[PDB]
């Protein structure tokens, strides 16, 4: 089946024969909400198209005709197959030959919608995946040096505090460490500054979401203009004597052609509206995600040395490449190593009490 081929051609990853290396393994380049939206926006028209051609209706004929008994079997087949290509209600009300082309174009329209909704996925894959992957992995490699440089070369501070009055050393020793060369990273404050003034992935993300929104609007227009007119129309009167059959002796207006699969058309015309009105607010929520700064976990991020640079750059216009980098980092920061200490520092959510809270928590997180 065509849907079987499209199941693996689209709606999945089509890069390399897989099992290559770290290009795809261990890194998530698509947000779970984006993946769900892509799946339920691409496979849904494909699912409806498959349901149109499924075992629910065992083939049969999409059109039925009431031809006179004088007609043979082949003549009846001719007058019923010549109307599936000439869907025109020759109404007696001049001669408004209203067309019923959506009935024949439904599979074409569904396939066109399925192909169209895959364009934003291709745009994201071939316009933002490489640069975003490079930035994410470089930043992850740089931030992986924030454990053997934030405690293991900082545990000498424990030696300094424990000799003197520890509460006093908690507030008047830290300026020496904050001014140390190795304590502050030398490359992140420039890379992040450069990324702050560049608008490249923000444009791609906004285009990816706006294309889906515009395609949903186009689907609404298609189903409100062409459909919803021939929606309760099941019978139409045709005319076979509209050509070389004019000089003959048989039914001029072969009345009462019937659309056998009208119910499937009606069900699809509503399931293509409900499914996408489900997705209408999800896209705008995805757009809102980038437009709002997030500071719910800034308290613990600012404490750590390397993440202090990320926390400081929290001002200005929210539309920056750094925002997309942060959005794809927080979904990827917990790959295999930050899963044991960053996820632990969640107790601090309420700098006086915070001054002494690390009296026993920070050193207790040692790997051995």
Q: How many residues bind a second copy (CB under 8 A)?
A: 80
Nearer to a second copy, 214 or 278 (CB): 278
Q: Which tokens is 219 given? A: 């689907």
Q: 221 to 260, contacts with a second copy by CB under 8 A?
A: 234-237, 243-245, 255-256, 258, 260
Closest CA to 230 of 91, 78, 53: 91
The DSSP bridge pattern shows strands 63-65 and 235-236 to be: unpaired
State the minimum distance, in angstroms, from the CB of residue 183 to a second copy: 14
Element spanning 223, H or E:
helix 201-225
Helix (H) or strand (E) holding 63: strand 63-65
Determine the number of helices (DSSP H) and then strands (DSSP E) in the chain. Answer: 16, 5
Q: Which of residues 271-330 bind a second copy (CB under 8 A)?
A: none
Of 153-161, 262-270, 285-293, 301-309, the segment contacting a second copy by CB under 8 A is 262-270
- Asked if 140 interacts with a second copy (CB under 8 A), we say no
Calculate the CA 331 to chain-centre distance: 15
Q: What is the 3-state secondary structure (H, E, C) of 267-294?
A: HHHHHHHHHHHHHHHHHHHHHHHHHCCC
Give the H/E segment covering residue 324: helix 321-330
Tokens representing 171 are: 């507030």
Stretch that binds a second copy, among 52-60, 209-217, 218-226, 293-301 (CB under 8 A): 52-60
Q: Which one of residues 2, 174, 214, 337 is an interface residue with a second copy (CB under 8 A)? A: 2
Shorter beta-carbon distance to a second copy: residue 156 or 197: 197
Q: Report the alpha-carbon distance of residue 245 to residue 55 in Å, rounded.
A: 37
Question: Which of 262, 298, 300, 319 forms a contact with a second copy (CB under 8 A)?
Answer: 262
What CA–CA distance (Å, rounded) separates 18 from 321? 29
Query: Of the candidates 27, 30, 75, 299, which one interacts with a second copy according to CB under 8 A?
Result: 75
Q: Which stretch binds a second copy (CB under 8 A): 13-21, 204-212, 313-321, 322-330?
A: 13-21
Kindly tell me which of 168 and 344 has the beta carbon lying closer to a second copy.
344
Among 93, 94, 95, 141, binds a second copy (CB under 8 A): 141
Closer to a second copy by Cβ: residue 184 or 308: 184
* The binder of a second copy chosen from 153, 288, 339, 354 (CB under 8 A): 339
CA 59 to chain centre: 34
Strand segments, DSSP code E, in 91-186 are 97-99
Structure tokens at 15: 């890069």
| Closest to 140 (Cα-Cα) out of 343, 325, 363, 357 | 325
- Lay out the site mask for a second copy across 177-196 (x = CB under 8 A, - = otherwise): ---------xx--xx--x--
Q: Is 56 in the site for a second copy (CB under 8 A)?
A: yes
Q: Given the rule CB under 8 A, which of 131-139, 296-304, 308-316, 321-329 is the region that contacts a second copy?
A: 131-139
Q: Does 73 bind a second copy (CB under 8 A)?
A: yes
- Residue pair 140/31 in contact (Cβ under 8 Å)? The answer is no
Q: Taking CB under 8 A as the rule, does residue 18 contact a second copy?
A: yes
The yes or no reply on residue 269 touching a second copy (CB under 8 A) is: no
Identify which of residues 229 and 235 has a Cβ nearer to a second copy in the complex: 235
């Amino acid at each position: 089946s065509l849907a079987h081929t499209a199941a693996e051609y689209m709606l999945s990853d089509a890069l390399l024969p897989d099992r290559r290396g770290p290009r795809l393994k261990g890194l998530r380049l698509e947000l779970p909400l984006d993946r769900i939206v892509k799946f339920v926006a691409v496979g849904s028209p494909l699912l409806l198209m498959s349901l149109a051609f499924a075992q629910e209706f065992s083939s049969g004929s999409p059109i039925s005709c009431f031809s006179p008994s004088n007609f043979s079997i082949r003549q009846a087949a001719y007058v019923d197959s010549s109307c599936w290509d000439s869907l025109l209600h020759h109404k007696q009300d001049q001669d408004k030959m209203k067309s019923l082309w959506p009935h024949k174009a439904l599979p074409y329209s569904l396939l066109a919608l399925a192909l169209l909704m895959y364009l934003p996925v291709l745009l994201w894959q071939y316009a933002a995946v490489p640069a975003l992957s490079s930035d994410l992995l470089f930043i992850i490699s740089e931030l992986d040096k924030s454990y053997n440089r934030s405690i293991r070369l900082v545990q000498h501070m424990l030696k300094i505090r424990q000799k003197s009055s520890d509460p006093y050393v908690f507030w008047n020793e830290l300026e020496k460490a904050r001014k140390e060369r190795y304590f502050e990273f030398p490359l992140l404050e420039r890379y992040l500054a450069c990324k702050q003034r560049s608008h490249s992935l923000v444009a791609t993300y906004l285009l990816r979401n706006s294309l889906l929104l515009i395609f949903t609007s186009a689907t609404y227009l298609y189903l409100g203009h062409f459909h919803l007119d021939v929606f309760f129309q099941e019978e139409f009167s045709c005319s076979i004597k509209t050509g070389l059959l004019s000089d003959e002796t048989h039914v001029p207006n072969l009345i009462t052609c019937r659309l056998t699969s009208l119910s499937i058309f009606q069900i699809v015309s509503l399931s293509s509206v409900a499914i996408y009105t489900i997705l209408v607010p999800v896209i705008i929520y995805n757009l809102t995600r980038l437009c709002r700064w997030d500071k719910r976990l800034l308290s613990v991020y600012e404490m750590l040395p390397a993440f202090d640079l990320l926390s400081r750059k929290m001002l200005g216009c929210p539309i920056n490449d750094l925002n997309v980098i942060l959005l794809f980092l927080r979904a990827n920061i917990s790959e295999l190593i930050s899963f044991s200490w960053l996820s632990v520092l969640c107790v601090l959510k309420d700098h006086n009490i915070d001054t002494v809270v690390d009296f026993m928590t920070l050193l207790a997180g040692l790997e051995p």
